[PDB]
Design a protein around this nucleic acid. Structure first.
Ligand SMILES: Nc1ncnc2c1ncn2[C@@H]1O[C@H](COP(=O)(O)OP(=O)(O)OP(=O)(O)O)[C@@H](O)[C@H]1O
Ligand SMILES: Nc1ncnc2c1ncn2[C@@H]1O[C@H](COP(=O)(O)OP(=O)(O)O)[C@@H](O)[C@H]1O
Ligand SMILES: Nc1ncnc2c1ncn2[C@@H]1O[C@H](COP(=O)(O)OP(=O)(O)O)[C@@H](O)[C@H]1O
Lengths: 220, 600, 472
DNA sequence: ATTTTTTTTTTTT
């Protein structure tokens, strides 16, 4: 969609056999390295390279040692984390803590919520739109929804009508952002009925949907 | 080799290829050394009538077989001159009475003729394949069998699957990269409906296309397209008859091209030093209109783009509307008609802003309608609508989305998509109590919502009273309208004076001269100097400090610094109205009077 | 082509026999294609066919080799060609189509006879009594289907309908009557050839149909030359019959609410096409309409009211496109809207969605059932002559020049094509003024080029009927 | 896969 013409619609077939399988996931920005298929009216690949969202660009999926010996600091992150705005060291560093992570225990059968869940209310010249966009950009496995918008409603998945027959739970942003962050904007305007959806999902890894007759988890 | 007349046909065609027409005009270093490879050397029948009129008819009476021969003549010539344009020995078609789609009466079969109409049901792409390039890894001979269909010639092979085990039962296998293929397309045509008769249901037509002829436009446009006829299938030995017309070239008519070589840029550079052309330029959207328009300048000009190194970018656009009822529904028209592809919409409608929701509950074909958006045609365009006061609150959300981002992001089972848009849009108005504007209150005499302060980009004033002093002034200008409307100021000639005491001239006051500075004007990049920041900072400080007081505080709702983006990127649109590679203190002055007219 | 037949009597007994019958046409197809002959590579012989099966190979005699099982690849550039329409009609309206259902026939056009006939017509024809299938869980034994052919159509052209599809003395009648300066208010007893009232409002129809002027300019606009009216009041004033009888008086239709509208982006039977019918700005581009019950109609088809009355800013997006058709339309309006003159004189609360409806139109004169006891008994007995005896066909025919439907419609449909008339040098706000259409109108009402302000402020004095409704 | 239908939920001032 970065090369699709203004007056056009993004169009989409890949066939790979053998060992190459399982080398991409739904929704990966990939490079792929032509044969028609028997009025005389698809593609076979070998490799899946992604300069974005791939093994050496992704986190957790030594090389830095020459610089790591040179680099021992905690504050320069703010100097290089979102230089776009002057001041506001604290808000950035608070998010840098959310970028930090590294807190967890699984004692006695139960886990502990080990992800930071920050909320923010306020609206002047604050420009808190460039921050969420900044985080959603740099943050590996990122997401974005709004207060409502369309086909999502800054939520998880729902079996909400008279269209056809599928029962497609349709996992949205809140579904998919796990092991990551789903960065909603203007949550206050989202909905009153919606607040219960953030209630059971707050704790962690828990979104039950007893509407179709299934124990859906979705591991929030 | 048919009957041997084909050869003299070839030679009669090649007799075009020798002298000043050929040597000066036609091909060679007019297409080929410009390195295009788009075969089609454009033909005009009237020359064929002039040299060989019998061969001006060999087409129109039997269009089955002039054609391989045309290709022969061409490939012979270009091979004779250029072995570079020679390794693509193919058909190589070329360019070359218009009746309606309602007016094909069994005939024109064999004829290369014109019909006019609409594009609709532009469809999928398919390849189609030319030959079979076989090799025998036992005996290792790259052999071949061409294919064909009626859609090019009369000849067809045993058109079927790849052959094998036919030569000997040897080691027998295909190869690819060698058996080439053809770009195939299909769609249908409707007449232009304004003519249409009320009693009948109009006919469509069906056509086919080919290689370099693939769809530079869209279903629901109109272009002149020329075609021959064939009809392949049977009629009840089988099943009855149905046809198509084909063998085509292309045009396009409803555009502007633009007698525009590098002279017209010389013109735009000629009137440059004329300083306050701003005046006429603002009198270039109100000849029939008081008031503003110097502000609509930038929404005509779109905006500017700026990106951080090793980062991201900014949405750039401007959107404003305001007053009392009775110029609003006959003002917007100025920008439906003039500035490229800027599309108003309904005001209270859906199924066409951005929404799909797989609405195929009729035919239920392959496609599930993944495209029902008419605001992404506003990508780098302009829009206006009515009913804003009546607008749904479904989209006020969606516009909160847009103004912040200007991208759509929907995943309602078609797909989890997102698509660029760089747009702007306008509005309507209705205060539920009329002539209450400030005395009762400034804001919310109107019937509105106040999340949208910083998301449009100016607050202005529009007001009315029928009067005592302006009573006779209204009278005399309405009359001067009514007869400067009219000639000598057919059914109606030209009206000049009071455009003559005004020392302009409608070929300096004109549309093409107006957009003289658009199309290169909309391609410049005039960076800032050393001066804005200071005064804009002091005066935005004064704006954010003292604009909220002294009987105008209640009319001082939108103070944010998100105006300061607007406060400056308007002087950008102004700075691309004159090609000055800077912006100035004079532009500073000219980019604050917005503030004064808002209330001052 | 003598003497007709019917359809409820014709079977095997009269098969392959040529007949005269009559009905009323419904709709039918376009024209596609046909041919008679061509030839093939395989034998290179003309495709000689009797009727308007499929074969020996004959790509054989190359020594021994045969090639049976039919390699016959048609070469249509060798061919011939004919026409088709495939027509259809419904049987009579007098021969029990009520307690039964109407049966019908399928047809076959050939060369020259298409583009001749559109439905809404009544015809006499000859044909052929043939069928299409072959024989003996459909067809429990052998059932088959009906059709006929085309031969020797002869249509009916019934008399005085057809200045629809198919003198200078009358111009003398036009003009030497037009010289009389007695047409403006003379015809205030004309458009109601059987009714009393609306007299000085018939004074304002005199400008309406003649139109104003689409005086376009060197810059963009094509502004609203067209003009409209509004009326309003309770039932009992015969405002139904006022629009019903007006149907015959240039092009119009008279239905209101839940029963055209927008486009017809649906399919047909024929290789599942999708082709449209348009709107009714289509059917009104110089023609105009008289239409009741704005309020008592679906709220869907009300974005196309502001999208035509204000600008003619029309557009579509059903399939992904804006068929941007336009038209020179205007409308008369009627209603039984909320609470009559007790509502009208006082302020503005009629429609609960917009005050917009007073802006774009000007002449809104009230319909009442006012009590006036001197006339209440008259209108109590203005309704027994109407109720009884079926006499009043042409009682207005004797009038000097307030009749002759044909000549009047032609009067107009010359008049609205004279030139670019204008006027002279010569709450009264901007849309009272933007009446100027009526000013220019009296040029074409006197059939003159020019006119002045205040002789033609006759319209002003008539508008003072309306402005008193919503002055206050 | 569409045509001729019907409710049971999906989510409510
Ligand atoms: N200063 C002016 N310049 C040009 N025309 C004017 C001016 N003042 C009044 N008019 C005329 O008055 C008419 C007012 O009705 P108009 O068509 O403008 O409604 P509208 O303003 O479009 O309503 P809305 O803006 O709410 O849609 C306009 O047609 C316009 O021609
Ligand atoms: N401290 C700051 N540094 C840089 N830019 C700022 C700062 N404060 C405001 N801005 C401006 O704010 C704009 C973004 O505002 P935004 O954050 O969208 O407001 P909101 O968060 O209310 O949506 C940017 O264009 C930027 O120029
Ligand atoms: N002056 C009149 N002359 C003849 N008939 C009248 C008159 N006034 C009322 N009517 C009666 O009014 C009836 C029609 O009312 P109608 O126009 O249908 O009301 P609406 O227009 O609200 O439907 C007719 O049947 C007619 O008999």
């Amino acid at each position: 969609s970065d090369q699709v013409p203004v007056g056009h619609i993004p169009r989409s077939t890949i066939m790979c056999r053998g060992e190459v399988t399982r080398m991409a996931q739904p929704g990966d920005h990939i490079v792929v390295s032509f044969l028609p298929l028997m009025g005389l009216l698809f593609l076979q690949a070998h490799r899946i390279i992604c300069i974005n969202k791939n093994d050496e660009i992704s986190d957790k999926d030594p090389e830095e040692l020459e610089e790591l010996a040179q680099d021992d600091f905690y504050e320069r992150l703010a100097t290089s984390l979102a230089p776009e705005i002057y001041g506001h060291l604290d808000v950035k560093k608070a998010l840098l803590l959310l970028l930090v992570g590294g807190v967890d225990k699984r004692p006695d059968g139960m886990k502990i919520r080990g992800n930071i869940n920050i909320c923010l209310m306020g609206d002047p010249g604050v420009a808190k739109s460039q921050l969420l966009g900044y985080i959603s950009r740099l943050a590996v496995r990122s997401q974005y929804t709004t207060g409502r918008g369309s086909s999502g409603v800054g939520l998880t998945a729902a079996v909400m009508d008279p269209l056809t027959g599928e029962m497609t739970l349709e996992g949205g942003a809140l579904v998919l952002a796990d092991q990551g962050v789903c960065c909603i904007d203007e949550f206050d305007k989202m909905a009153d009925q919606d607040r219960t959806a953030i209630h059971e999902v707050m704790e962690q890894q828990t979104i039950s949907i007893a509407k179709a007759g299934i124990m859906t988890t979705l591991n929030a | 080799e048919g009957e041997q007349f084909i050869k003299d046909i070839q030679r009669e065609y090649v007799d075009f290829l020798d002298d000043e027409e050929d040597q000066g005009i036609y091909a060679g270093h007019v297409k080929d050394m410009i390195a295009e490879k788009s075969k089609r050397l454009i033909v005009n029948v009237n020359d064929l009538k002039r040299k060989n009129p019998q061969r001006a008819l060999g087409l129109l009476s039997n269009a089955a077989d002039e054609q391989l021969a045309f290709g022969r003549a061409l490939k012979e010539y270009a091979s004779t001159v250029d072995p570079g344009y020679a390794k693509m020995h193919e058909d190589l078609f070329v360019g070359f009475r218009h009746v309606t789609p309602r007016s094909l009466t069994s005939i024109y079969l064999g004829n290369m003729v014109c019909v006019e109409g609409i594009v609709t049901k532009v469809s999928l792409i398919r390849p189609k394949v030319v030959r079979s390039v076989h090799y025998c890894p036992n005996t290792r001979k790259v052999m071949e069998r061409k294919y064909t269909d009626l859609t090019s010639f009369e000849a067809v092979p045993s058109g079927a699957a790849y052959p094998t085990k036919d030569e000997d039962g040897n080691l027998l296998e295909t190869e690819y990269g060698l058996s080439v293929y053809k770009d195939h397309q299909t769609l249908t045509i409707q007449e232009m409906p304004e003519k249409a008769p009320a009693g009948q249901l109009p006919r469509s037509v069906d056509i086919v296309c080919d290689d370099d002829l693939v769809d530079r436009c869209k279903p629901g446009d109109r272009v002149q397209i020329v075609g021959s006829y064939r009809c392949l299938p049977g009629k009840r030995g089988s099943g009855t008859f149905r046809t198509v017309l084909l063998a085509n070239n292309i045009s396009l008519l409803s555009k502007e091209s633009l007698d525009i070589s590098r002279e017209d840029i010389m013109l735009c550079k000629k009137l440059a030093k004329n300083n306050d052309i701003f005046e006429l330029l603002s009198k270039s959207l109100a000849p029939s209109i008081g008031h503003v328009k110097q502000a609509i300048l930038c929404l005509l000009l779109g905006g500017v783009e700026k990106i951080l190194p090793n980062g991201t970018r900014l949405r750039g656009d401007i959107n404003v509307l305001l007053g009392d009822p009775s110029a609003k529904s006959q003002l917007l028209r100025y920008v439906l008609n003039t500035a490229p592809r800027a599309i108003p919409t309904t005001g209270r409608g859906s199924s066409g802003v951005g929404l799909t929701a797989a609405v195929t509950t009729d035919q239920e074909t392959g496609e599930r309608r993944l495209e029902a958006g008419a605001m992404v045609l506003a990508d780098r365009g302009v829009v206006c609508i009515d009913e804003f006061d009546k607008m749904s609150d479904i989209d006020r959300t969606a516009i909160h989305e847009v103004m912040e981002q200007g991208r759509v992001t929907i995943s309602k089972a078609g797909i989890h998509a997102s698509l660029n848009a760089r747009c702007s849009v306008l509005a309507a108005a209705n205060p539920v109590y009329g002539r209450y504007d400030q005395y009762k209150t400034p804001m919310e005499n109107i019937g509105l919502q106040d999340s949208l302060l910083s998301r449009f980009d100016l607050l202005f004033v529009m007001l009315d009273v029928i009067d005592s002093d302006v009573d006779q002034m209204i009278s005399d200008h309405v009359v001067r309208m009514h007869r400067y409307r009219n000639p000598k100021e057919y059914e109606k000639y030209d009206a000049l004076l009071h455009g003559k005491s005004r020392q302009r001239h409608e070929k300096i006051l004109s549309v093409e001269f107006m957009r003289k500075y658009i199309h290169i004007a909309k391609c410049m990049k005039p960076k800032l100097g050393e001066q804005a920041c200071e005064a804009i900072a002091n005066e935005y400080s004064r704006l954010r400090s003292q604009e909220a007081v002294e009987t105008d505080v209640a009319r001082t709702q939108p103070i944010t610094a998100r105006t300061l983006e607007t406060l400056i990127r308007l002087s950008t649109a102004h700075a691309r109205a004159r090609m000055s590679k800077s912006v100035t203190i004079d532009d500073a002055h000219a980019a604050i009077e917005l503030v004064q007219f808002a209330y001052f | 082509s003598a003497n007709p037949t019917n359809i409820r009597q014709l079977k095997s007994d009269c098969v392959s026999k040529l007949v005269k019958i009559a009905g009323i046409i419904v709709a039918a197809s376009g024209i596609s294609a046909k041919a008679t002959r061509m030839s093939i590579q395989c034998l290179s012989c003309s495709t000689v066919i009797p009727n308007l099966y499929a074969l020996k190979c004959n790509t054989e005699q190359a020594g021994r080799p045969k090639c049976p099982l039919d390699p016959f690849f048609i070469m249509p550039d060798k061919c011939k060609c004919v026409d088709f329409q495939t027509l259809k009609l419904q049987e009579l309206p007098d021969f029990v189509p009520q307690g039964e259902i109407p049966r019908h026939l399928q047809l076959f056009c050939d060369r020259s006879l298409c583009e001749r006939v559109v439905p809404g017509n009544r015809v006499l024809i000859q044909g052929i009594y043939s069928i299409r299938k072959v024989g003996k869980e459909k067809a429990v034994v052998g059932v088959r289907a009906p059709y006929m052919r085309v031969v020797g159509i002869t249509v009916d052209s019934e008399g005085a309908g057809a200045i629809s599809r198919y003198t200078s003395d009358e111009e003398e009648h036009f003009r030497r009557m037009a010289a009389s300066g007695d047409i403006y208010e003379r015809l205030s007893q004309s458009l109601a050839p059987s009714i009393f009232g609306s007299r000085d409002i018939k004074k304002a129809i005199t400008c309406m149909l003649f139109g104003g002027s689409r005086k376009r300019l060197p810059d963009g606009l094509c502004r609203r030359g067209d003009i409209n009216v509004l009326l309003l009041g309770d039932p009992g004033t015969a405002k139904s019959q006022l629009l019903k009888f007006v149907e015959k008086v240039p092009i119009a239709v008279y239905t209101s609410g839940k029963g055209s509208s927008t486009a017809s982006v649906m399919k047909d039977p024929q290789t599942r096409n999708f082709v449209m019918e348009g709107g009714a700005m289509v059917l009104a581009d110089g023609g105009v309409v008289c239409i009741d019950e704005f309020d008592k109609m679906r709220e869907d088809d009300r974005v196309a009211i502001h999208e035509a009355m204000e600008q003619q800013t029309i557009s579509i997006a059903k399939a992904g496109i804006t068929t941007t058709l336009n038209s020179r339309c205007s409308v008369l309006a009627a209603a039984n809207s909320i609470f009559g003159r007790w509502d009208d004189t006082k302020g503005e609360e009629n429609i609960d969605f917009m005050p917009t409806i007073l802006s774009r139109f000007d002449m809104i004169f009230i319909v009442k059932d006012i009590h006036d006891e001197s006339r209440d008994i008259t209108l109590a007995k203005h309704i027994i002559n109407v109720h009884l005896s079926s006499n009043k066909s042409a009682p207005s025919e004797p009038a000097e020049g307030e009749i002759s439907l044909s000549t009047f419609k032609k009067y107009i449909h010359y008049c609205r094509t004279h030139c670019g008339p204008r006027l002279s040098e010569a709450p009264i706000t901007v849309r009272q003024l933007e009446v100027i259409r009526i000013s220019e109108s009296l040029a074409k009402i006197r059939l003159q080029p020019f006119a002045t302000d205040e002789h033609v402020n006759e319209a002003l004095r008539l508008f003072q009927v309306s402005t008193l409704d919503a002055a206050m």
